Design a protein around this ligand. Structure first.
Ligand SMILES: *[C@@H]1O[C@H](CO)[C@@H](O)[C@H](O)[C@H]1NC(C)=O
Ligand SMILES: *[C@@H]1O[C@H](CO)[C@@H](O)[C@H](O)[C@H]1NC(C)=O
Ligand SMILES: *[C@@H]1O[C@H](CO)[C@@H](O)[C@H](O)[C@H]1NC(C)=O
Lengths: 232, 215, 46, 241, 104, 128
């Protein structure tokens, strides 16, 4: 038994030589799998998607895993996956318009506390009287910080909601006045989300009668150029 | 001793770290050190064997992070070549992030909660920008009870408070605490802990920070 | 216009490192009660 | 390069290196202005900014640091009809960026190597020189720049058959000489000299096969067929068509 | 020894983005000092695994060979529990230690 | 007219010459760290009426030539394997085969000079 522990042999020899053999020329990536570095993950990347040949030789055992990373098209919505937002801006009956925002939670239960992040269009500002009327109770909240600012330099606003319904749309509206006049008006935006998760949000843009939120883009297949000026 | 320049890194950035090589008297020495980079799964992905000689006990190294990578707690494992049984480690998180530009501090009045305190756990929220100036905004504070690793949120304890002059206060009432758990016997809560989560949003709505104080 | 810096004369800030000043300095100055003070000039980031 | 001798700084100025973080991957050739001619197959990263370009390096371990100027990579240009299976249309362009202070990139060392316009300029059995940083025998080595003489051979379908395309490829190899660029020196220059010693880029190292066996010569993608393709991207400046 | 990093200029001059500043470093003669400047935003996201002096002394104290605050059951236990081996020619000696780790 | 920040190159530092703020007429000289060489004759950037001088200097790690195993000996240490460049810092080990004793320096690392800290040893038969 003492001679058995003497003639005791250490470990089964591990020495793999794994060569990537490509018909084309690039560099020469060789791999020496030894006992001292058996657990070392040896990753080799290849940009062309193709059948190729792997040639291993030597004593020992190994595992080969070919895993290809890519970009897959997504049917499911990447933006506004958990919230529906519809924003409309219409001329009210000096230029004043009416902004209407209707949101609905896409869940089984009601949404909790949410944030309405409203950015004005360049040159427009909310009506002070209208904000105070929305802010009183009714499960809404506009901070004093927002309500005290003058009509000028009031281009951002945050309306706090105590909850938003999942059963139907909760809608609000208020008047917006044109305090600055510009030939090119930048579209405003509204962003709804729940306080416990900022990633699950929805953002819509508005521009006085310009479909959706988007600028005049020219798109085909993947590749879009800006078309936000005169045709010629 | 391993020192990384930061605690968290984005995919693509370079990790700069120094290994200080001393003896049991903490005096700088020149020896050979084996370094292993290890992914959150546990598989070593980069081994190396360097020398501390002519380096005055300081060994400057760097490791490049691939673009496509698995997030989570990575590890650097070093050990002297002569002593492979004494393995020193440091972790660094890999994650996609942006700087919050401000800090939120959730500070309870006491470092504990007396089970028979009717006032409950009063917490002060202090938010200030990273350059010192205070922060005006709104904070959503919510409480929870932690039992080992099982967290039970208390929906009734949700509060919305104004952050005025960089400071706010929010109280978890004892009644809500007892009502949240489905056990009238308060003695069972002894041995458990409370955690507080606060989300502060600027009035501009351009930054949001969630912070937590558990245990 | 009048009384304003032209657009081309404004150099935008671009240096926003999360960590920097990964430098090495040696204290070779004549000691004062065993302490050697070294004044080091650094350029702050943006 | 199997055979050949160690290159020295003055000999082949038009040689250009491409080195990533993990060693050096192939190498191109300077064709004037701020443009480099390489193979499309070797570099295939839409994460191009890290690629870096070295010139007049000759030896990878002890540069002389004198006039060893290296330049960043601005933009890559791949052939639209590149085939990955047959290695057809294996050509690509490299644009080197320089600061806005100077209009162009001034590299006073490397010499342009012109572009061929017709496949009839040079014929087989002509003395051509392919040079780069490849691997002689199977030895890794590849520290110092190697160059060697090769001959163009006609109708390469005798050795490769259907895989070869004479309109878009060209074969150069020495019988029993085995002097053949191999592995690491892909996309490199296949340079041939004229009667005036005007230096031409007849081809770039495409795919080939295992060096050594004279019954399998190296295959290089022919430059003269893609003369008009380069002109569209780099304009009409430089050498007379 | 000691190592202090402080302002190498006056306290009227305020730091401005890009402005040169002087850093006063005072430490032991001949010591090699390594530096690092980190944005505090990093620590707002993660403030763990940070190198401090307290953690260094922690590692040292965890590799200590003593296992008791003091004394022992006998005169040999005092030496063994305080991380010492006493051995006299007359025969008074401490028991052998075959455990790298302290008893639980 | 103040130029921009000249930018930090990896494994290197820069000093301003002729002034204390990135203004017109200053020079920014670069110098790599220990174990890193400054390849390229261009090492400075100068604030002109437009911007700085051409591009940004580069710092590369010095490399050491790979060493084969001595006769009747093998090298089974170091990094991820064969016949490759060894950059600054890395170290190798020599262990002679059974029946052969080492005759020189057993360890060595990649020194500053792009050369090894010690010379390659020999493996001689065990003799008493
Ligand atoms: C091959 O090329 C050489 C050029 O040196 C020429 O002399 C020889 O005749 C050629 N042989 C054939 C078979 O074309
Ligand atoms: C090309 O033609 C035949 C194909 O039938 C081929 O076997 C031969 O080697 C080539 N001949 C010449 C003159 O190139
Ligand atoms: C061209 O190269 C040959 C090669 O020896 C040389 O003799 C000659 O001088 C060179 N120049 C011209 C104009 O032929």
């Amino acid at each position: 038994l003492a001679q058995y522990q003497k003639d005791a042999p250490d470990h089964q020899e591990l020495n793999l030589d794994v060569s990537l053999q490509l018909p084309s020329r690039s560099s020469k990536i060789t791999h020496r799998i030894h006992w001292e570095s058996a657990s070392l993950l040896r990753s080799e990347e290849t940009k062309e998607n193709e059948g190729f040949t792997v040639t291993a030789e030597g004593k020992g055992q190994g595992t080969l895993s070919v895993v290809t990373m890519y970009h897959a098209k997504a049917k499911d919505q990447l933006t506004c996956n958990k919230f529906d937002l519809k924003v409309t801006i219409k001329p009210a009956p000096k230029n004043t318009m009416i902004l209407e925002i209707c949101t609905r939670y896409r869940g089984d239960q009601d949404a909790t506390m949410s944030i309405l992040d409203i950015s004005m269009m360049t040159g427009f500002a909310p009506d002070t009287d209208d904000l105070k009327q929305l802010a009183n109770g009714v499960d809404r909240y506009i901070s004093k910080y927002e309500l005290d600012k003058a009509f000028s330099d009031r281009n951002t606003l945050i309306i706090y909601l105590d909850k938003v319904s999942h059963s139907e749309d909760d809608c609000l509206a208020f008047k917006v006045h044109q305090y600055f006049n510009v030939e090119l008006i930048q579209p405003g935006a509204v962003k709804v989300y729940a306080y416990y998760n900022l990633e699950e949000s929805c953002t819509r843009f508005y521009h006085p009668e310009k479909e959706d939120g988007k600028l005049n883009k020219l798109c085909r297949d993947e590749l879009c150029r800006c078309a936000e000026e005169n045709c010629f | 001793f391993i020192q990384t320049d930061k605690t968290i890194y984005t995919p693509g950035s370079t990790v700069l770290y120094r290994i200080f090589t001393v003896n049991h008297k903490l005096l700088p020495v020149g020896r050979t050190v084996m370094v292993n980079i290890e992914n959150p799964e546990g598989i070593p992905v980069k081994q190396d064997s360097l020398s501390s000689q002519n380096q005055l006990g300081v060994l400057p190294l760097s490791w490049d992070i691939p673009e496509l990578v698995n997030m989570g707690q990575w590890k650097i494992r070093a050990y002297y070549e002569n002593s492979p049984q004494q393995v020193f480690s440091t972790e660094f998180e890999v994650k996609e992030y942006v700087l919050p530009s401000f800090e939120v501090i959730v500070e309870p009045t006491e470092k504990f909660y007396y089970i028979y305190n009717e006032k409950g756990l009063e917490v002060t929220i202090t938010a200030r920008f990273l350059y010192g100036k205070k922060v005006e905004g709104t904070a959503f504070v919510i409480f929870g009870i932690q039992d080992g690793e099982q967290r039970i949120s208390l929906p009734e304890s949700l509060k919305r408070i104004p952050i005025e002059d960089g400071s706010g206060e929010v109280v978890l009432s004892r009644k809500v605490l007892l009502d949240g758990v489905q056990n009238p016997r308060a003695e069972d809560l002894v041995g458990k802990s409370l955690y507080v989560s606060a989300t502060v949003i600027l009035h501009s709505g351009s930054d949001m920070v969630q912070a937590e104080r558990s245990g | 216009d009048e009384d304003i810096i032209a657009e081309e004369n404004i150099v935008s800030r671009s240096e926003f490192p999360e960590s920097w000043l990964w430098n090495v300095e040696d204290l070779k100055e004549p000691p004062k009660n065993g302490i050697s003070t070294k004044l080091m000039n650094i350029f702050l980031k943006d | 390069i199997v055979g050949g001798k160690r290159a020295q700084l003055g000999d082949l100025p038009w040689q250009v290196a491409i080195k990533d973080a993990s060693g050096i991957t192939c190498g191109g050739i300077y064709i004037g202005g701020c443009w480099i001619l390489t193979a499309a197959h070797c570099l295939r990263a839409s994460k191009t900014h890290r690629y870096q370009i070295w010139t007049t390096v000759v030896d990878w371990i002890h540069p002389d640091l004198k006039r060893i100027v290296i330049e960043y990579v601005d933009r890559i240009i791949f052939h639209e009809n590149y085939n990955a299976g047959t290695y057809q249309n294996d050509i690509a362009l490299i644009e080197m960026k320089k600061d806005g202070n100077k209009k162009d990139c001034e590299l006073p060392r490397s010499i342009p190597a012109c572009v061929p316009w017709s496949p009839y300029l040079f014929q087989p059995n002509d003395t051509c020189i392919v040079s780069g940083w490849g691997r002689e025998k199977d030895n890794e080595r590849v520290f110092s720049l190697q160059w060697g003489e090769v001959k163009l051979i006609s109708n390469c379908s005798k050795f490769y058959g259907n895989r070869f395309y004479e309109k878009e490829m060209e074969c150069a190899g020495t019988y029993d000489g085995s002097i053949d660029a191999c592995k690491g020196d892909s996309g490199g220059p296949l340079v041939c000299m004229d009667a005036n010693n005007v230096t031409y880029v007849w081809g770039v190292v495409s795919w080939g096969e295992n060096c050594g066996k004279p019954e399998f010569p190296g295959v290089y993608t022919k430059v003269a067929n893609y003369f008009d393709w380069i002109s569209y991207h780099v304009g009409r400046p430089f050498i007379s068509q | 020894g000691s190592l202090v990093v402080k302002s190498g200029q006056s306290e009227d001059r305020q730091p401005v983005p890009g402005q040169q500043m002087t850093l006063k470093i005072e430490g032991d003669h001949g010591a090699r000092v390594v530096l690092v400047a980190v944005d505090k935003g990093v620590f707002v996201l993660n403030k763990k695994n940070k190198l401090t002096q307290s953690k260094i002394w922690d590692v040292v104290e965890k590799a200590d060979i003593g296992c008791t605050p003091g004394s022992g059951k006998d005169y040999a236990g005092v030496f063994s529990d305080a991380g010492l081996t006493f051995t006299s020619s007359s025969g008074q000696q401490t028991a052998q230690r075959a455990e790298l780790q302290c008893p639980q | 007219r103040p130029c921009g920040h000249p930018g930090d190159t990896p494994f290197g530092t820069f000093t301003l010459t002729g002034g204390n703020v990135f203004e017109y007429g200053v020079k920014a000289v670069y110098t790599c760290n220990e174990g890193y060489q400054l390849l390229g004759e261009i090492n400075y950037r100068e604030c002109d009426t437009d911007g700085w001088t051409n591009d940004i200097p580069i710092c590369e790690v010095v490399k050491c030539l790979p060493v084969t195993a001595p006769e009747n000996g093998k090298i089974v240490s170091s990094a991820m394997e064969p016949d490759r460049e060894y950059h600054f810092g890395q170290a190798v080990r020599f262990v002679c085969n059974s029946g052969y004793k080492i005759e020189g320096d057993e360890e060595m690392h990649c020194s500053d000079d792009g050369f090894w800290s010690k010379e390659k040893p020999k493996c001689v038969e065990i003799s008493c």
